[PDB]
Design an enzyme around this catalytic site. Structure first.
Site, PDB file in Angstrom:
ATOM      1  N   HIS A 219       0.981  -1.317  -0.023  1.00 33.91           N
ATOM      2  CA  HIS A 219      -0.043  -0.028  -0.029  1.00 33.91           C
ATOM      3  C   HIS A 219       0.923   1.323  -0.082  1.00 33.91           C
ATOM      4  CE1 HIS A 219      -2.157  -3.264   1.943  1.00 33.91           C
ATOM      5  NE2 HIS A 219      -3.110  -2.784   1.077  1.00 33.91           N
TER       6      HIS A 219
ATOM      7  N   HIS B 187       2.625   4.703  -2.409  1.00 36.59           N
ATOM      8  CA  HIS B 187       2.492   5.479  -3.549  1.00 36.59           C
ATOM      9  C   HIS B 187       3.949   5.910  -3.679  1.00 36.59           C
ATOM     10  CE1 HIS B 187      -2.005   5.644  -3.348  1.00 36.59           C
ATOM     11  NE2 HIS B 187      -1.951   5.847  -2.032  1.00 36.59           N
TER      12      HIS B 187
ATOM     13  N   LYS C  84      -7.351  -2.249  -6.644  1.00 35.76           N
ATOM     14  CA  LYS C  84      -7.387  -1.323  -5.675  1.00 35.76           C
ATOM     15  C   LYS C  84      -8.711  -0.668  -5.753  1.00 35.76           C
ATOM     16  CE  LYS C  84      -6.169   1.132  -2.043  1.00 35.76           C
ATOM     17  NZ  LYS C  84      -5.786   0.871  -0.411  1.00 35.76           N
TER      18      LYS C  84
ATOM     19  N   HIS D 269     -10.667  -0.160   0.570  1.00 32.30           N
ATOM     20  CA  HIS D 269     -10.729   0.985   1.980  1.00 32.30           C
ATOM     21  C   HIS D 269     -12.173   0.835   2.418  1.00 32.30           C
ATOM     22  CE1 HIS D 269      -7.189   3.497   0.245  1.00 32.30           C
ATOM     23  NE2 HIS D 269      -6.820   2.180   0.660  1.00 32.30           N
TER      24      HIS D 269
ATOM     25  N   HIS E 162      -8.143  -0.488   6.788  1.00 31.21           N
ATOM     26  CA  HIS E 162      -8.758   0.295   7.889  1.00 31.21           C
ATOM     27  C   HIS E 162      -7.879   1.376   8.110  1.00 31.21           C
ATOM     28  CE1 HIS E 162     -10.597  -3.342   8.514  1.00 31.21           C
ATOM     29  NE2 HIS E 162     -11.634  -3.016   8.545  1.00 31.21           N
TER      30      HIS E 162
ATOM     31  N   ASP F  56      -6.737   2.558  14.319  1.00 26.61           N
ATOM     32  CA  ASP F  56      -7.139   1.742  15.457  1.00 26.61           C
ATOM     33  C   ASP F  56      -8.171   1.581  16.320  1.00 26.61           C
ATOM     34  OD1 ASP F  56      -6.096   3.939  16.939  1.00 26.61           O
ATOM     35  OD2 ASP F  56      -4.721   2.859  18.310  1.00 26.61           O
TER      36      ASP F  56
ATOM     37  N   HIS G  53      -4.070   2.239   5.437  1.00 30.98           N
ATOM     38  CA  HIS G  53      -3.901   3.602   4.828  1.00 30.98           C
ATOM     39  C   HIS G  53      -4.296   4.688   5.647  1.00 30.98           C
ATOM     40  CE1 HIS G  53      -8.051   2.732   4.659  1.00 30.98           C
ATOM     41  NE2 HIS G  53      -8.363   3.541   4.289  1.00 30.98           N
TER      42      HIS G  53
ATOM     43  N   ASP H 286       2.562   4.091   6.353  1.00 29.74           N
ATOM     44  CA  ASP H 286       1.387   5.083   6.592  1.00 29.74           C
ATOM     45  C   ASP H 286       0.733   4.885   7.627  1.00 29.74           C
ATOM     46  OD1 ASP H 286       2.935   6.594   4.456  1.00 29.74           O
ATOM     47  OD2 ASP H 286       0.805   6.755   3.252  1.00 29.74           O
TER      48      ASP H 286
END
Lengths: 318, 318
Positions: free
Chosen positions: A20, A22, A134, A166, A195, A198, A219, A257
């Protein structure tokens, strides 16, 4: 065999894989229109290679880039950076949230064909093929979301390539996604439900994992943008541990990320260097793994998550 | 001198001008990624030329395309179609609503520079320069809107190129735009405040026109999408007449789309041919002018609106 931007590679070649990411494209194509501000394609490729090489020295061997056409994906730049840094790169097909009307007005059937095109024929005129699907989805649940989710389930069923999503603003939105995949006959092991934090109920997460889905702690939504105050990456890292402790280490996928707490993609177009991750993509291997090890997690387990999990997931399975 | 996609031309060369058109780009760049669905760049250029030629036969000589980079603008295709059809084409700089974060995160100062680039230096690497600044704005009023409006006022002040806007969901949103321009020191005659329908208060419209602004009855917002029922283009045409009757013929700009009632841009990516304008861009000259003439409007007046108004507006005035 997994499709990379330089061709197919075997599973054992993959090694330690970061998911994941970029790598480029933060300008969403605006660098072509305003290189003076955004920078030249070459200077960008230079910035990237430098980063990849550091990651590689740290042990990384493969990277899964999840940029889609609608947010600036440039596979030829990716192929170039891959060769120069000697790091494998898997590119994606799929759509981001709020895609253009051109795609937004397409049916499940048309959408399935576009994704198939990018995987079986190649991206643009590059002859480069996608190795993952994706699906980015924002907040309130739409019918459009459903459609995209279904076209992705079919493309996966036809080809065996994985789907990574997502989850929206809804509650247990992932249960609703699971339902779609399941009703399409797609094996859950082909899907990663992502997700952004947390805050989800562990009971919710585990249940999904119990069904065979991959859990992505993967993400940070692209936004302009406290209640929850501000958690540390150490605290987020702990979630990994819990899942592991619950018996789910085989179902986890995690990104730099998600851990760090900021979208790297956004950071690059922002004014603020305060938002930057000094470790770049090496953050996981340089800091996160050590931290988990210090918390008691076994080496082999950590290795299962950064090598095994990704491989099995990417490996086209029908 | 007005900048066209094939170079500068003199005002007298312009002739009968259609404004606020979208000649191509309905795929928002997706035709590069999925030519099989969207069609090839050549077949698209063919479709366009065919249309231009019909318009031209009808008397049209120049067309103002308002596509911006963020919605698929392709100046090289425009230059090609212009040469082949022998019709002048003016291209735009500006942004659409909901631009990417890359631009969405930029300051007034940076934004002014990007617009200046497209006008003074050229678009991309084409050496083709913009001849108008386009500002599309949707619904609720944002700070971002303000910024974009201000960067556009400055680019105009520096260069003398005109600004054409889309008014938001707010009430008398145009008064709020006027205020911005005015506070930037931009002459109102350099600005066209656009409207999507005939529902605005005439008192509101006239007041703006009384201040020197150009009134645009110029666009149909790009949407997926009754209360008001459904008006005929004949009824909308009547608004032109009222404005004219009120003494404002020198301040009007009108487009095919606003009259017809549907966004041509959207129509091209839709499944429904039911939404199509059989007259294409020739709709105004073939049907609307005749209708107004039949309602009593003098030839010369109609000519002031389709030749004079556009010319004066495009002509860079400082």
């Amino acid at each position: 065999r997994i499709n990379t931007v330089r061709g197919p590679i075997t599973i054992s070649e993959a090694g330690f894989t970061l998911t994941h990411e970029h790598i480029c494209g933060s300008s969403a194509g605006f660098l072509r229109a305003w290189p003076e501000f955004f920078g030249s394609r070459k200077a960008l490729a230079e910035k990237a290679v430098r980063g990849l090489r550091r990651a590689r020295a740290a042990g990384v061997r493969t990277i899964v880039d999840v940029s889609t056409f609608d947010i600036g994906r440039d596979v030829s730049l990716l192929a170039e950076v891959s060769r120069a840094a000697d790091v494998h790169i898997v590119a994606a097909t799929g759509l981001w949230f709020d895609p253009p009307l051109s795609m937004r007005l397409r049916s499940v059937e048309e959408l399935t064909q576009f994704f198939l095109r990018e995987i079986q024929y190649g991206i643009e005129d590059t002859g480069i093929r996608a190795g993952i699907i994706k699906v980015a989805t924002t907040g309130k649940a739409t019918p459009f979301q459903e459609l995209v989710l279904k076209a992705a389930a079919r493309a996966s069923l036809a080809t065996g390539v994985p789907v990574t999503t997502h989850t929206a603003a809804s509650q247990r939105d992932g249960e609703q996604q699971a339902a779609i995949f399941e009703s399409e006959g797609l094996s859950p092991s082909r899907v990663c439900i992502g997700h952004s934090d947390d805050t989800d109920d562990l009971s919710y997460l585990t249940a999904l994992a119990a069904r065979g889905y991959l859990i992505g702690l993967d993400h940070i939504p692209h936004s302009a943008i406290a209640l929850l105050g501000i958690r540390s990456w150490q605290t987020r890292a702990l979630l990994i541990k819990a899942l592991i402790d619950q018996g789910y280490m085989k179902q986890i996928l995690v990104s730099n990320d998600w851990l760090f707490g900021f979208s790297s993609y956004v950071t690059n177009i922002m004014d603020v260097m305060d938002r930057v991750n000094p470790d770049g993509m090496a953050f996981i291997p340089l800091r996160v793994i050590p931290f988990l090890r210090e918390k008691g997690v076994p080496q082999e387990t950590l290795a299962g998550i950064t090598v095994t999990n990704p491989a099995r997931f990417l490996s086209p399975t029908l």
